[PDB]
């Protein structure tokens, strides 16, 4: 052989001396080696796997490798503090984080420590970070929508509560933007008081600089959408174990709502980065590396997490936990290791293209690849109908786009389909930090599928959208109220809409052709 890390000269010397003094080996440990944030500890028997331990200085660690002669611990802090020979005492409890309502409106660390400085956190109890996901029985069919506010998503890629939707795309394509837009739309219920619709939002930041997080918090405070959202931060400066725990800490905070019958939405930003942190801990522990140096159970790491987002049945309370994991593809290739895993785990994926972002299509959502398994079951009764026709038209238009540059040369009835598709894509565009209520979405998508937009010039579609909504919001308020309460587009409302839209297009100042 070569050697064993447990055969230290100091430990061996005691055996040779013959003095059987271990200074309470159980529940106490002595550090043998420290490197790259990993400390091997001799002794410390009776320590559970995944338990917190306290070092002489005060920093905590997590016992991840229980070996025969030592314990491989990952230090939750700066590695410079503790040195060889230090004593390690097991805390006696698995890692847990505080939960409750008093947390909404506060920025927390991975372990629940408030870093915003607003004051001491007052909560009732704490929950374990690692637990099993609900079974098959406790669950229930996904029948309730989670309105992101994005026209393209809510129409073509519907997200139902208790669903796992993956926001995947290259760098700087508008992924974090979609997450924040969702949070803003959820604010109307808290302001109004519709408890049935209230959806608490949880934002988990992994491997992100603190500057962008401060900007993110300012935006939420600016739009007032704070006070019902929780931000969990594991920044780039934080040790790797913290970036690995943050998602689980956030998921536990969300399970609180889910168990109690409340609805919560959790967003993991830079989820791929969490895998990188886990890989570091694993490689430093000398565990067998796999493809792209990732450990064998990287997949497992994500599954046990995402599977905790579920729609509990009415017996348990009816709560739900909707997930929105983010993934950054390097060259737009989803054939990589981590993308394939998270795609196989999640229900559907929102695929963002950078080329579309350049072409001015914001959000740069590729509806061709983007798919939702739940599908229509999530949408409200009003959308499902028109959304189906919308999807078909876009599919035909993408097929025909190959001939876009040859417009006049091609015959009629085909160039017309090309023109129609352009109006729709322009309608699907949307500004940043501008979420739309579902009722307004129905009116706009209705105007588009019926074909009224073919009259206008493409450049005027967005002006019509904002201007027409203002008129409908002002005058036809009962129409919107019905769509909001009933949840479906009745025949009478359809006729009312079908008559005023073209009339508005004429009296509107915007040109047409």
């Amino acid at each position: 052989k070569k050697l064993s890390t447990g055969e230290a000269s100091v430990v061996l010397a005691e055996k040779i001396k013959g003095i059987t003094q271990q200074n309470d080996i159980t529940e106490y440990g002595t550090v043998i080696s420290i490197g790259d944030g990993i400390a091997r500890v001799f002794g410390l028997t009776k320590v559970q796997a995944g338990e917190m331990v306290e070092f002489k200085s005060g920093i905590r660690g997590m016992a991840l490798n229980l070996e025969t002669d030592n314990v491989g611990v990952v230090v939750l802090g700066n590695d410079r503090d503790i040195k060889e020979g230090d004593v390690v005492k097991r805390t006696g409890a698995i890692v847990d984080v505080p939960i409750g309502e008093a947390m909404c409106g506060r920025v927390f660390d991975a372990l629940g420590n408030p870093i915003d400085g607003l004051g001491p956190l007052k909560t009732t109890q704490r929950a374990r970070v690692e637990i099993k996901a609900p079974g098959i029985i406790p669950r229930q069919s996904v029948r309730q929508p989670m309105q992101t506010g994005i026209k393209c998503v809510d129409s073509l890629v519907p997200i139902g509560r208790g669903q796992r939707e993956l926001i995947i795309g290259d760098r700087q394509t508008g992924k974090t933007a979609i997450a924040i837009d969702t949070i803003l739309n959820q604010k109307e219920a808290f302001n109004t008081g519709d408890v049935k619709k209230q959806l608490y939002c949880i934002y988990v930041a992994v491997g992100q600089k603190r500057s962008t997080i401060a900007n993110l918090v300012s935006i939420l405070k600016q739009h007032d959408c704070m006070k019902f959202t929780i931000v969990v931060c594991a920044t780039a400066s934080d040790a790797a174990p913290l970036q690995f725990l943050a998602p689980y800490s956030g998921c536990a905070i969300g399970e609180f709502f889910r168990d109690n019958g409340k609805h919560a939405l959790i967003i993991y930003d830079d989820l791929s980065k969490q895998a990188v942190a886990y890989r570091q801990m694993s490689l430093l522990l000398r565990r067998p590396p796999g493809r792209e140096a990732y450990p064998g159970d990287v997949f497992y790491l994500h599954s046990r997490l995402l599977e905790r987002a579920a729609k509990m049945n009415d017996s348990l309370g009816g709560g739900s936990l909707t997930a929105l994991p983010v993934i950054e593809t390097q060259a737009g290739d989803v054939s990589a290791y981590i993308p394939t895993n998270v795609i196989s785990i999640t229900d559907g994926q929102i695929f963002l293209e950078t080329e579309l972002f350049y072409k001015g299509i914001r959000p740069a959502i590729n509806v061709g690849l983007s798919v939702s398994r739940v599908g229509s079951a999530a949408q409200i009764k009003a959308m499902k109908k028109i959304a189906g026709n919308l999807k078909l038209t876009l599919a035909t238009y993408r097929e025909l786009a190959a001939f876009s540059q040859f417009g006049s040369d091609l015959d009629a009835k085909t160039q017309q389909q090309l023109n129609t598709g352009e109006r729709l894509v322009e309608m699907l565009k949307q500004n940043q930090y501008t979420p739309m209520k579902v009722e307004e979405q129905v009116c706009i998508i209705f105007a588009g599928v019926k074909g009224f937009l073919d009259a206008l010039v493409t450049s005027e579609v967005l002006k019509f959208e904002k201007k027409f909504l203002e008129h409908v919001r002002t005058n036809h308020s009962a129409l919107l109220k019905r769509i909001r309460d009933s949840g479906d587009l009745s025949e009478v409302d359809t006729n009312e809409l079908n008559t005023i839209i073209p009339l508005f297009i004429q009296e509107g100042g915007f040109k047409l052709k």
């Binding site: 490197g35 060889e84 430093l284 390097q330 350049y358």
Partner: protein, 470 residues
């Protein structure tokens, strides 16, 4: 009194055996009996009172059993105005030959990043004088700035121009830490700052500090000299709320040096041969480069993209830390355009209608759509030609070529290559020039006049002059 002694020497990694009171990690150890001061940075405790360290200088000449002294603190470097106008090493040695450095105190290069509560982010446009940057990827005073480039696309020339354009006439101080780059460039920059009077031999002047950990230096030096430059800036920031300009010549060399010794340190290699701790090693550095309540730091760092593969782990991870990003494209160089700033790939967190004028945002988006539409047409143009295109498409192609050429700007530092004097473009003039091009102000004139010009008026005059010449 030396308690330790060398026990193992492999490459740049050195193991030391101590008798008692081992030094904390990251401390600096001094080897005795060397012709030159040799320092070792503690990296691991191997047990049995052994520590594994990385050498800052060449280990050739070491001998097993050589005594080692523990300083009891990490590598401390002199900070303060004494470093202004003086070239310094990774460990603080003066390599300018002008004498010892006077410092109020010595600060360690390792420290915890600033808290979240004292982040104090703020957005304020930074006029660099470069129209493409000022238009498409505006820079923010107090925010990080990245120049992603391959081999020989012009990011070194761009750093020099930013210095000439921003460093001068800047109330605060400036720092230039060049890690991993060639030594010839270092001599040129020193002489240029001396000529430009940015630095001088006369004391009380020379508002700029220089740190160099160039190639010739072994690993560990290239991996910690960046921290040394950053420490100088942190003093200038915290102790004095003075705006600081931090210029980091290629930082990719920082991660590269770490990986050169990761294997000997015992770590398992990662995906592309990098160390497992790439992200954390890099993030520990980036988080320290930030504006806070006390002062602001404007950091311009160049990231070398090996083989023009933007998916490499090093630059890919760096992307997340940057506020403004400037991606240099090699294709433009083939076309002759300089600077080779990819207008589409380059992004800026400040490119927001609220931060900057709505007109600025509108103009930038129009340019991007114009260039992207032109790139899409290139394919069919290859097969059919420009003639078979419609008038609309022809106008798009014509205006895009003029805009792409107009993006080229001649800088002072580039004269020797081109022979045309540099030029500075204000923000208002830049936006108006591009706004006019979009409206068809220059669709009359030849595209040749929109090359290496500063403002639209200058370009139009040159076109009219060439006509009267012929």
């Amino acid at each position: 009194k030396a308690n330790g002694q060398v026990s193992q020497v492999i490459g740049a990694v050195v193991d030391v055996q101590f008798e008692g009171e081992l030094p904390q990690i990251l401390n600096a150890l001094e080897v005795q009996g060397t012709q030159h001061r040799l320092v070792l940075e503690v990296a691991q405790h191997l047990g049995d009172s052994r520590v594994r360290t990385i050498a800052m200088d060449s280990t050739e000449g070491l001998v097993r059993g050589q005594p080692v002294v523990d300083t009891g603190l990490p590598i401390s470097v002199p900070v303060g105005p004494g470093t202004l106008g003086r070239i310094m090493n990774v460990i603080g040695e003066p390599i300018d030959q002008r004498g010892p450095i006077k410092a109020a105190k010595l600060y360690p290069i390792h420290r915890d990043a600033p808290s979240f509560t004292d982040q104090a982010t703020s957005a304020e446009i930074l006029v660099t004088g470069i129209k493409v940057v000022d238009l498409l990827a505006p820079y923010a005073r107090g925010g990080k700035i990245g120049l992603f480039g391959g081999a020989g696309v012009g990011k070194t020339v761009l750093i020099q121009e930013l210095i000439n354009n921003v460093a001068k006439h800047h109330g605060g101080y400036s720092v230039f830490a060049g890690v991993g780059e060639r030594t010839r460039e270092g001599n040129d920059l020193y002489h240029e700052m001396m000529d430009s009077k940015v630095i001088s031999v006369k004391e009380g002047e020379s508002r700029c500090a220089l740190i160099f950990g160039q190639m010739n230096e072994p690993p560990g030096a290239r991996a910690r000299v960046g921290l040394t430059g950053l420490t100088v800036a942190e003093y200038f920031r915290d102790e004095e709320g003075k705006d600081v300009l931090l210029f980091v010549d290629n930082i990719f060399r920082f991660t590269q040096a770490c990986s050169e010794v990761s294997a000997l340190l015992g770590r398992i290699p990662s995906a592309v041969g990098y160390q497992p701790t790439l992200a954390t090693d890099l993030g520990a550095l980036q988080e320290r480069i930030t504006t806070t309540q006390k002062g602001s730091i404007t950091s311009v760092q160049a990231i070398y993209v090996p083989a023009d593969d933007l998916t490499d782990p090093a630059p890919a991870t760096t992307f997340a830390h940057l506020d403004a990003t400037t991606v240099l494209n090699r294709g433009l160089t083939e076309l002759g355009i300089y600077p080779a700033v990819d207008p589409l790939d380059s992004t800026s967190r400040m490119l927001d209608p609220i931060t900057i004028g709505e007109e600025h945002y509108t103009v930038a988006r129009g340019v991007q759509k114009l260039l992207q539409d032109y790139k899409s047409l290139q394919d069919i143009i290859a097969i059919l030609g420009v003639d078979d295109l419609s008038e609309e498409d022809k106008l798009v192609v014509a205006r895009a070529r003029k805009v792409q050429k107009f993006l080229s700007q001649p800088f002072f530092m580039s004269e020797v290559f081109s022979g045309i004097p540099g030029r500075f473009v204000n923000l208002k003039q830049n936006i108006a020039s591009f706004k006019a091009l979009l409206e068809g102000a220059g669709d009359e004139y030849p595209e040749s006049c929109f090359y290496m010009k500063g403002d639209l008026e200058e370009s139009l005059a040159a076109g009219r002059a060439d006509a009267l010449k012929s």
